Amino acid sequence: MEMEKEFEQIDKSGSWAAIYQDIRHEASDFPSRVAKLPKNKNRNRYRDVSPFDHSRIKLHQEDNDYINASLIKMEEAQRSYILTQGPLPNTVGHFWEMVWEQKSRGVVMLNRVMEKGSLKCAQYWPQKEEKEMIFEDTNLKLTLISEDIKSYYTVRQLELENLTTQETREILHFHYTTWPDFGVPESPASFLNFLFKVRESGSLSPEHGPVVVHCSAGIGRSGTFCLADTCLLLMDKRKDPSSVDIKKVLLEMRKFRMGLIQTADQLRFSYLAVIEGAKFIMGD
Numbered sequence: 296m297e298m299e300k301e302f303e304q305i306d307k308s309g310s311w312a313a314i315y316q317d318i319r320h321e322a323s324d325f326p327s328r329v330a331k332l333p334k335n336k337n338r339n340r341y342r343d344v345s346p347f348d349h350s351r352i353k354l355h356q357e358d359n360d361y362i363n364a365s366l367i368k369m370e371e372a373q374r375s376y377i378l379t380q381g382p383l384p385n386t387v388g389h390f391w392e393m394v395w396e397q398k399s400r401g402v403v404m405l406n407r408v409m410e411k412g413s414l415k416c417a418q419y420w421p422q423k424e425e426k427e428m429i430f431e432d433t434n435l436k437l438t439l440i441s442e443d444i445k446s447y448y449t450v451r452q453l454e455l456e457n458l459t460t461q462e463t464r465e466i467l468h469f470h471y472t473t474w475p476d477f478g479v480p481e482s483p484a485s486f487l488n489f490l491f492k493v494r495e496s497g498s499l500s501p502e503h504g505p506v507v508v509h510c511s512a513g514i515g516r517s518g519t520f521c522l523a524d525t526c527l528l529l530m531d532k533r534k535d536p537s538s539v540d541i542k543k544v545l546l547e548m549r550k551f552r553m554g555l556i557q558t559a560d561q562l563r564f565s566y567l568a569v570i571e572g573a574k575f576i577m578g579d
């Protein structure tokens with residue numbers, strides 16, 4: 296496997312930091328003027344993480360259409376993803392407005408609500424069946440239907456009701472609960488098992504709106520998830536699977552959201568995940 300030989304060449308040479316800085320240097324720079332308007336300051340978790348204007352998701356409202364969220368559209372793979380920050384106390388209603396308006400079937404969460412002793416996102420879904428949540432600013436109701444807790448992830452069934460029309464939809468919440476507070480997982484086995492559970496649900500399929508994927512900033516862990524999924528899909532579709540270039544796929548994804556893959560360790564982990572996942576793509 297050429298990809299694995301390259302991995303072995305970068306590992307033996309210890310050049311992960313050098314490869315990663317080359318990506319940072321060649322990455323796209325597009326305007327984010329709407330993100331930086333004074334009216335939007337309390338809609339951004341991090342001053343240095345903003346959606347580009349050309350790819351941002353617009354809310355269907357005349358007052359203020361802004362959310363920190365990007366559409367990643369992968370033309371050859373025929374997959375789309377929405378990558379967004381962890382919701383803030385004043386954007387939980389906007390978050391669920393976006394899921395409703397974009398016709399999404401799945402939400403993929405890659406962080407815990409508290410990590411490193413600090414809050415990384417709002418508690419934006421209900422924890423008990425009999426205590427539903429109402430978002431008065433966007434006119435939505437959200438109810439917990441069922442919860443399935445596993446060793447490495449939790450899957451939840453949620454009911455989202457548009458209180459304006461009384462239409463309801465089932466949303467699937469896929470919560471990866473074991474990413475370590477520091478660094479990356481030692482093995483990609485649990486992360487690949489999780490990716491395959493999201494796929495098997497239909498949440499990534501073209502009959503639905505794009506999956507919504509978040510972590511705290513929506514660029515690091517979130518970037519790893521979409522990069523691994525698109526690379527493995529391209530390996531399945533191409534006559535020459537050996538031709539899939541993870542660095543070129545990452546730079547294509549960075550045309551749509553800044554900063555995807557935050558560290559050289561996240562870049563090495565993405566290679567390991569694709570290399571191990573291919574071995575099943577090889578029919579094994």
Ligand SMILES: Cc1c(C(=O)O)oc2ccccc12
Pocket residue numbers: 296297298530536537538573576577
């Ligand atoms: C990358 C790759 C190679 C190779 O590098 O030779 O062979 C494959 C078979 C299936 C899926 C991916 C691959």
Ligand SMILES: Cc1c(C(=O)O)oc2ccccc12
Pocket residue numbers: 440452453454464465
């Ligand atoms: C998803 C769901 C709902 C709902 O969305 O209200 O009600 C159920 C009953 C059994 C199994 C699944 C469901």
